């Protein structure tokens, strides 16, 4: 019908595609950026090498919600959904997939500088901590809209 | 109802509002920002003379004069009920288009004399007429973009 | 009165205004891309 | 056990009897602002109880952690 | 000479060139009718993009403005702390260039309603969306010129202030007057929307 | 109200003291009439601060 | 247009960088410290100025004039290097090329060999290398291969003129590059002077040595400037003051100022009026190189004044060059 | 951020109406427990 | 912002109520104020062992603005008893003065009637209803144009 | 010890969320829930991980 | 569908929820990572500044907060069969805070850099950096205002 | 009708519009680029009240080119205007601004050097004002194109 | 056929274009970048060429990924394959493309720093493997949803 | 009329516009980078307008061409003119404008170049002018085809 | 006719004008590069203007088949010409043109470097001009093709 055009599933099918898509974009940044900062660090200091591999672990969390959005908005495709559902599961996946980009742009600067820092300054590890949980909020916001999006995806849905 | 006077003929108006407005600003904040870097630190904190450091600003605020008359006399000419052409909307966008131009590249000029003259005939009062002079010939510019939008507005919206 | 079959009048605005937000996307990723690290004050002492 | 977990802990757990024992009063006394509304729960002393349980739950952490202060 | 944005630019250019010599040399150049697009397009769209770049452009330079003089006067604070609370005026007026921009926002939603389908593409209507559209882009846009005027202005009052407090006050001329350029814009937006009915 | 605030104040030294001020005057008294819009406008962030 | 997009980065950077210009001590300043009668005076007298207790830790006994030299050099260098350490970008690597220029001074003062690095901005990893690199044929390949001068390299004085002449062309050609159009001009206005400078000297270094070719000096006049290219070549044929003198006949700057008086003080004098006139850009970088060169002056004139009253002949002390 | 926008009604807002402002600091005379903590001034302050 | 001019008049002495209480019409939540309340009292209650203590300085600066910060809550909880908010939830300590409908069926779009004006406060029948932003704006974009 | 713990943490990292999502959304075909455990699980790893980092 | 109500209608809306959040996500995202940054250098001297540093990365935070909020509100507004009117409605919420929030997360993030390394060497810059953050955030804030308000007139 | 649209008149709008834009901005440019360059020597510059105003003066006279042609097309457009009418008024606003900015680009260039490499020999000011006239008739040859082409502009239209 | 257009397998071919192209560029950035590191790194020890050729390892196993998808997408084409099919084989290969695309740019630039630090320090090659794993499990999840999509490809279908 | 379209006569206007823009354009890089260059006669007044000026002349008559070219094209020009007359027309004006164009820029180039070395050493002036030549003749092809174009643009057509 | 449309002769037009357009930049800028060259060589030696002024000829050379390919197709432009014609016309234009282009470009180059080289190293000269020869039959090349692919634009056509 025209509710569910032959390509409404176009929509789905690219927004799946982005989430993980830019989510690895904004996670890739960040495990380069701050990569590059703990193999700069860790040459003179190679016991913090445990502690300045957090920014990493927070770009990995913006692959993870990537991931995650992906697989749902995956399960949540097929031939005959509407349109609507098209729009949907593109806006989740846009929303979190760039929503984790700008998190792990964040993450990456804040990771490589932090790490530089801390490795002269023990004490400024406690605020690249802060700083990174508040950069990596923003990719779970996205997450966070993409979820609810996806949620909404297929209620009340008509064919 | 009219082949020449189609409902989507507004939009070309208020594009001709927008045009006349926010490019004369554009023309007003370059020649008023342009020069006023250079009246900081030109004027040595004497105050008599002021009013002559600030003829620059004073002319880049004048063509933003120019650019709200032919954005007001555009607006007045554009309502919903009337019977408002599509000639009338071309010529509208005309009118901005030529006093937002003129108008940016009057303050484009402005600015770039305004800000080494002000540093100049501060400190050497002789040149004052010079660049007043270059000035004038930076502001009639936009006299001449105002001139062609009054002429435009007259003979559109006849 | 359709101006297209294929470049209807809703797919037309739906690029329009997609285009509009892809411009600022770009617009802001430049921005983005453009912080560069003030290494000094935290490198190597 | 340390002091500054515990007044932490305490703190929030004050709060947290006070405000979910309230809520669920609310919910157990049918109120408007918290089931008047069909989205809301349809049965209020039914979320009542289990508000009510919560509370009591922050209220073994408010005592718990006033023994550790 | 190479860089991807004027490679786009130009491919475009030369894509549309092409597309409108095919259109108009087989006789069909009636088909890109921006005429009928503008008719056909919901005046929604218009009112709404126009309500917010208004706003987004509003607020785009008062923050340009913003950094620009913010950053200037905390570095110019270092040595003269006392710059500060002098020369915030700028970031002031650089503000107010956003609030500019959300008074016309609220003027303009105060238009917002839901227009009948029987009624809805109307002489009326068509005016309106147009109206809402090209006053937002008018305000918006001279709103981000003046923030960016403003806080450039308010920047060299800053630098100027710390050299010496005496240069700070005929800068404060030039703010008022870049203010004075954002405020005509308001005025001129609207002008613009003041004849425009609401959607009906 | 505008050209009463350019002149009268200026005016009296020019006559009474026995004008230098009319360049101040003139700034304050253009401020004052456009600070009393932006000012009113300003306020509104109580009403944005407290819907937000 | 030029501030529109320069604070992004640079508007912290440039404020406080004019915030320092503030601090340069006025003629009036300067007046002071002349007027002073001893060391410990003048140490009360300068901290009364933008220097503040830098010298707070030194006694009278122990203040000598090399100590308020090494003090106050010690103080532009840690604000260069705060600033350089808050830049990044194009900003970071301007202050980078500006730092070359020591470490080229710094090579060619340790090579002599007892001359230490002598200074702190042209540091780098391998640079008390040089104190020991007795060997000129081993200097590229072993040690400043490593350094950020291997793209200049291709009796000492040679060296030095050379790398000279390739790291201001480089500069020059990364000014006109990555730099905005205000700050275009005005680096490219000092680096006409310096390279102008550079020729000159080295045309009357040259006036001593018979070995001096005219194609000799092509690998070693930078040729930028207003003196480019006309009046470089004039110098590279020229043999003697002579010709130098007839060859400044052809500019308009710095025309008449090398014919009389201290070469010395005009050129310093010159800078300081490119350094003022660079300061009067609102959003230019050049502001940073006109305020290095203007604390190396005043570093300068404080220390010439220290001299003047440790070691009295005060008939001196108001030979030192200043604009403020 | 709405204590600092109340600071913004005031000093901007309110005082400039009336505020005439630059005036003279009293801070008298007065002897204070000077700790040592002042070391890192004058000498980490120039 | 600068000290005053000598024997003018000192704006700190309106400060003292008006700089809290446009905290509060910007703020403007009992619970929030409550906590704020708290907060500040958590200060002023124990004042004499924070004084003469080492304070670093975020909570040196808590310290120092102790009855600030009490006056911001306390205004804050009258004015989120005007904007009738408790967080997010309204009181329902008055009688109405909008009565719905007698009846209706459950999904219909109903309309209060004006069967009086609520005493003091926001009426807490506007809460949950889809025009209460209509309401909400009308009245706190008036109520900061006449304040100011 | 930091050499093998450390490989602990980015396994967990690496699977326990991804398991911890496709057994949830077995369990129940409630999408939002699935992902809220997703989520946690992954920042629960991560609050764990800065815990040990603090602790040294 | 009807001529009200288009299938096309909830691509506005849902590419609007999505504007709020990616928008404002990435201003404050330039304003974390320029905060940090400047946090990161300063604190290496001075640790004990670490909390009044931490301003304007909270700020930008509070940006993506403002995002956030709109977004939900947006999404809880859509459906496949609303009207193009809703949709517009819910694109131009989106499209304001985003755009302003983005901004606003420039500008905190440019102000809150200078404002750390200042109020590192000038202690008394802390109320100057802060009191111009706020005047930056509050243009996120007006955006979402603005959205708030559109949002109001959706159904 | 098939001969008049109803869209003729826009590209009669938009030559009008050139006409204005592109010879304000080369006079723009010429007069910011003269006015501007004057340093050296000419910071004195004690022998008159001016000495950078020719190129600024010919710059003004591209403007006033493009004022002329502006204001004929304005008075020579129309709302049942021919499309034929709408391509001759655009053509005629093409040449003379494009024209005119390329003599607008050349006089700021001429004039640029001119001030820039002042020197106390009359020869350059005495001089380079034929450079500045073949810099200038590069806008009168514009002004040319587009008068006659004006006036081809309603010959033998139906 | 409406549901299955003649131009449904033109999505599906360039997704397993892309899965392999986009793959392979990014383990092409990350072998480049990973080995001038790398012999950057041998020419001052050499001793550690085996060690240190991990991340071009890492870097290959993306094109592989890519090929795997490349090849499961290749077989699931035909020629009146569904346009949903279409769509759905160019997300998994986009997906899988460019996350790839990501991981190696990542594996690259902190295998580029790791060959050099774990030289200078032995200790850092643990790190650099952490490192080059939470890369290189950008393009496993890359992997993964291309895998998903590929299987809900043909899966009640018509 | 299938041959003679109402949008016949646009591209018979836009090589008419063409014909002077695009070669005022060349003639003005040709007179402004030349004499920037002549401006190194600062120095030797007696080769300042005697000599030096050649460069400037010669894109003059390249800008001669131009409105020869455009003149000749206008005066061709018709309401119901062939559409074979408007590709014609348009070919021409775009052969000479942008043939004028690259003559200009050689002029430019090499008028600059050779200028600054006569001034320094007379005898490559001779050479100088033969090179000009070269690079004005580039023009004067121009010139040939367009002229050639419009002795055909109306030859044939019904 | 469908093969013979009226549009047909759009392409036979933009052939002819590419055909001396790009050829005659191409020519420009060779002969541009190697006037640099030439002036800043004959300065120091000005008695080789004879053996340096070889690669401008052979850019005027490139630049004489870019006329002779225009003039060519424009003897067969026609109001009522083939389709077909009109785009081997527009092929020769470009064959012509942008093999003389880049055949310009190697001549310049090669001629710039030649000649800042042949001064100081005399037997260079010959050297130079076998590359010139290679560069400039570069060009031959286009003219060949266009010449056949013009033989056969009007050899088959109904």
């Given at each position: 019908t025209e509710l569910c055009p032959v390509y409404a599933p176009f929509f789905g099918a690219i927004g799946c595609a982005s989430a993980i898509i830019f989510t690895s974009l904004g996670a890739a940044y960040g495990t380069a950026k701050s990569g590059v900062g703990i193999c700069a660090t860790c040459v003179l200091r190679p016991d913090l090498l445990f502690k300045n591999i957090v920014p990493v672990i927070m770009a990995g969390i913006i692959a993870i919600y990537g991931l995650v959005v992906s697989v749902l908005v995956?399960?949540?495709?097929?031939?005959?959904?509407?349109?609507?559902?098209?729009?949907?599961?593109?806006?989740?996946?846009?929303?979190?997939?760039?929503?984790?980009?700008?998190?792990?742009f964040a993450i990456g600067i804040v990771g490589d500088a932090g790490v530089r820092g801390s490795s002269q300054q023990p004490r400024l590890f406690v605020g690249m901590i802060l700083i990174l949980i508040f950069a990596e909020v923003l990719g779970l916001y996205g997450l966070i809209v993409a979820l609810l999006l996806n949620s909404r995806a297929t209620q009340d849905v008509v064919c | 109802s009219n082949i020449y006077a189609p409902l989507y003929a507004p939009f070309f108006g208020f594009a001709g509002c927008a045009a006349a407005m926010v490019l004369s600003c554009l023309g007003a904040a370059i020649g008023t920002a342009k020069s006023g870097i250079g009246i900081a630190g030109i004027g040595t904190f004497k105050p008599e003379l002021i009013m002559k450091s600030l003829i620059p600003?004073?002319?880049?605020?004048?063509?933003?004069?120019?650019?709200?008359?032919?954005?007001?006399?555009?607006?007045?000419?554009?309502?919903?009920?009337?019977?408002?052409?599509?000639?009338?909307?071309?010529?509208?966008?005309?009118?901005?288009?030529?006093?937002?131009?003129?108008?940016?590249?009057?303050?484009?000029?402005?600015?770039?004399?305004?800000?080494?003259?002000?540093?100049?005939?501060?400190?050497?009062?002789?040149?004052?007429?010079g660049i007043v002079l270059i000035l004038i010939f930076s502001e009639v510019l936009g006299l001449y973009g105002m001139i062609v939008a009054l002429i435009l507005n007259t003979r559109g919206s006849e | 009165d359709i101006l297209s079959s294929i470049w209807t009048e809703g797919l037309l605005m739906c690029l329009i205004v997609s285009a509009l937000l892809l411009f600022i996307l770009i617009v802001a990723l430049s921005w983005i891309s453009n912080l560069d690290i003030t290494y000094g004050a935290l490198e190597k002492s | 056990?340390?002091?500054?977990?515990?007044?932490?802990?305490?703190?929030?757990?004050?709060?947290?009897?006070?405000?979910?024992?309230?809520?669920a009063h609310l919910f157990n006394t049918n109120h408007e602002s918290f089931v008047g509304s069909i989205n809301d729960p349809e049965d209020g002393p039914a979320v009542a109880h289990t508000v009510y349980l919560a509370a009591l739950v922050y209220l073994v952490f408010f005592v718990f952690c006033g023994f550790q202060v | 000479k190479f860089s991807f944005s004027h490679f786009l630019y130009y491919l475009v250019l030369?894509?549309?060139?092409?597309?409108?010599?095919?259109?108009?040399?087989?006789?069909?150049?009636?088909?890109?009718?921006?005429?009928?697009?503008?008719?056909?397009?919901?005046?929604?769209?218009?009112?709404?993009?126009?309500?917010?770049?208004?706003?987004?452009?509003?607020?785009?330079?008062?923050?340009?403005?913003?950094?620009?003089?913010?950053?200037?006067?905390?570095?110019?604070?270092?040595?003269?702390?006392?710059?500060?609370?002098?020369?915030?005026?700028?970031?002031?007026?650089?503000?107010?260039?956003?609030?500019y921009g959300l008074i016309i926002a609220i003027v303009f939603s105060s238009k917002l309603t839901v227009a009948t389908a029987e009624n809805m593409y109307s002489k009326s209507n068509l005016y309106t969306g147009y109206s809402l559209f090209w006053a937002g882009i008018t305000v918006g846009a001279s709103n981000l010129i003046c923030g960016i005027a403003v806080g450039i202005t308010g920047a060299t009052a800053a630098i100027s202030d710390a050299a010496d407090s005496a240069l700070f006050v005929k800068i404060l001329v030039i703010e008022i007057f870049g203010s004075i350029l954002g405020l005509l814009g308001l005025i001129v937006g609207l002008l613009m929307a003041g004849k425009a009915s609401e959607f009906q | 109200c505008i050209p009463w605030l350019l002149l009268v104040k200026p005016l009296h030294f020019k006559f009474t003291h026995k004008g230098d001020i009319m360049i101040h005057q003139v700034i304050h008294t253009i401020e004052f009439c456009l600070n009393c819009v932006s000012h009113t406008a300003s306020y509104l962030r109580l009403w944005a601060l407290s819907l937000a | 247009m030029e501030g529109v997009y320069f604070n992004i980065d640079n508007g912290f950077i440039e404020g406080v960088v004019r915030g320092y210009r503030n601090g340069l001590l006025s003629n009036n300043q300067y007046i002071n410290l002349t007027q002073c009668d001893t060391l410990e005076d003048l140490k009360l007298q300068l901290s009364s100025t933008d220097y503040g207790n830098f010298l707070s830790s030194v006694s009278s006994e122990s203040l000598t004039t090399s100590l308020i030299q090494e003090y106050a050099s010690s103080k532009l260098y840690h604000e260069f290097n705060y600033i350089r350490d808050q830049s990044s970008?194009?900003?970071?690597?301007?202050?980078?090329?500006?730092?070359?220029?020591?470490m080229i001074d710094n090579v060619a003062l340790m090579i002599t060999g007892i001359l230490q690095r002598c200074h702190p901005l042209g540091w780098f990893d391998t640079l008390?290398?040089?104190?020991?690199?007795?060997?000129?044929?081993?200097?590229?390949?072993?040690?400043?291969?490593?350094?950020?001068?291997?793209?200049?390299?291709?009796?000492?004085?040679?060296?030095?003129?050379?790398?000279?002449?390739?790291?201001?062309?480089?500069?020059?050609?990364?000014?006109?590059?990555?730099?905005?159009?205000?700050?275009?001009?005005?680096?490219?206005?000092?680096?006409?002077?310096?390279?102008?400078?550079?020729?000159?000297?080295?045309?009357?270094?040259?006036?001593?040595?018979?070995?001096?070719?005219?194609?000799?000096?092509?690998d070693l006049l930078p040729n930028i400037g207003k003196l480019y290219p006309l009046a470089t070549f004039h110098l590279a044929q020229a043999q003697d003051f002579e010709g130098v003198r007839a060859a400044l006949a052809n500019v308009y700057e710095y025309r008449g100022f090398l014919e009389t008086g201290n070469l010395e003080d005009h050129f310093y004098q010159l800078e300081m009026e490119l350094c003022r006139d660079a300061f009067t850009q609102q959003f230019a970088i050049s502001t940073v190189w006109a305020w290095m060169k203007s604390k190396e002056q005043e570093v300068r004139n404080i220390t010439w004044i220290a001299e003047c009253i440790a070691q009295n002949q005060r008939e001196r002390i108001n030979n030192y060059i200043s604009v403020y | 951020?709405?204590?600092?926008?109340?600071?913004?009604?005031?000093?901007?807002?309110?005082?400039?109406?009336?505020?005439?402002?630059?005036?003279?600091?009293?801070?008298?005379?007065?002897?204070?427990?000077?700790?040592?903590?002042?070391?890192?001034?004058?000498?980490?302050?120039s | 912002y600068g000290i005053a001019q000598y024997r003018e008049i000192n704006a700190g002495l309106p400060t003292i109520v008006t700089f809290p209480f446009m905290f509060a019409i910007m703020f403007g939540d009992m619970?929030?104020?409550?906590?704020?309340?708290?907060?500040?009292?958590?200060?002023?209650?124990?004042?004499?062992?924070?004084?003469?203590m080492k304070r670093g300085e975020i909570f040196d600066m808590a310290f120092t603005g102790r009855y600030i910060i009490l006056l911001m809550g306390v205004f804050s909880m009258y004015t989120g008893f005007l904007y009738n908010d408790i967080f997010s939830k309204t009181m329902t300590i008055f009688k109405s003065g909008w009565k719905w409908p007698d009846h209706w069926k459950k999904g219909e779009s109903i309309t209060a009637t004006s069967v009086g004006t609520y005493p003091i406060g926001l009426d807490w029948a506007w809460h949950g209803t889809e025009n209460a932003l209509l309401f909400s704006n009308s009245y706190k974009m008036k109520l900061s144009i006449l304040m100011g | 010890a930091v050499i093998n713990k450390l490989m602990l943490f980015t396994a967990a990292m690496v699977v326990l969320p991804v398991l911890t999502f496709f057994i949830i959304q077995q369990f129940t075909p409630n999408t939002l829930i699935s992902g809220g455990l997703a989520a946690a699980m992954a920042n629960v790893v991560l609050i764990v991980y800065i815990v040990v980092a603090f602790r040294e």
């Open positions: 995956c399960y949540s495709l097929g031939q005959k959904q509407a349109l609507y559902t098209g729009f949907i599961q593109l806006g989740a996946g846009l929303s979190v997939g760039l929503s984790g980009l700008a998190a792990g | 600003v004073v002319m880049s605020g004048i063509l933003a004069i120019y650019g709200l008359v032919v954005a007001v006399l555009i607006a007045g000419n554009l309502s919903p009920t009337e019977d408002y052409t599509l000639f009338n909307g071309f010529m509208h966008l005309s009118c901005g288009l030529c006093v937002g131009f003129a108008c940016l590249s009057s303050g484009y000029a402005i600015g770039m004399v305004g800000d080494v003259g002000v540093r100049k005939y501060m400190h050497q009062p002789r040149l004052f007429v | - | 056990v340390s002091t500054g977990k515990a007044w932490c802990c305490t703190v929030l757990s004050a709060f947290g009897v006070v405000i979910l024992s309230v809520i | 030369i894509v549309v060139i092409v597309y409108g010599l095919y259109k108009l040399f087989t006789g069909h150049g009636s088909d890109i009718n921006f005429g009928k697009f503008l008719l056909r397009t919901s005046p929604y769209m218009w009112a709404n993009l126009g309500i917010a770049l208004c706003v987004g452009l509003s607020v785009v330079g008062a923050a340009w403005g913003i950094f620009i003089t913010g950053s200037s006067m905390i570095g110019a604070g270092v040595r003269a702390p006392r710059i500060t609370t002098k020369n915030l005026i700028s970031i002031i007026f650089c503000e107010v260039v956003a609030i | - | 970008g194009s900003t970071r690597k301007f202050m980078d090329y500006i730092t070359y220029g020591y008390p290398t040089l104190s020991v690199a007795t060997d000129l044929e081993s200097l590229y390949e072993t040690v400043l291969v490593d350094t950020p001068l291997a793209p200049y390299f291709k009796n000492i004085e040679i060296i030095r003129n050379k790398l000279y002449k390739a790291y201001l062309e480089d500069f020059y050609n990364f000014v006109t590059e990555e730099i905005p159009e205000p700050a275009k001009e005005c680096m490219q206005t000092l680096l006409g002077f310096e390279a102008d400078r550079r020729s000159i000297n080295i045309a009357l270094n040259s006036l001593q040595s018979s070995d001096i070719d005219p194609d000799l000096k092509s | 951020s709405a204590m600092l926008h109340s600071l913004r009604l005031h000093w901007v807002e309110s005082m400039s109406k009336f505020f005439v402002g630059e005036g003279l600091p009293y801070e008298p005379f007065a002897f204070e427990y000077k700790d040592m903590e002042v070391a890192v001034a004058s000498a980490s302050s | 619970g929030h104020g409550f906590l704020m309340t708290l907060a500040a009292l958590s200060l002023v209650l124990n004042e004499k062992k924070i004084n003469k | -």
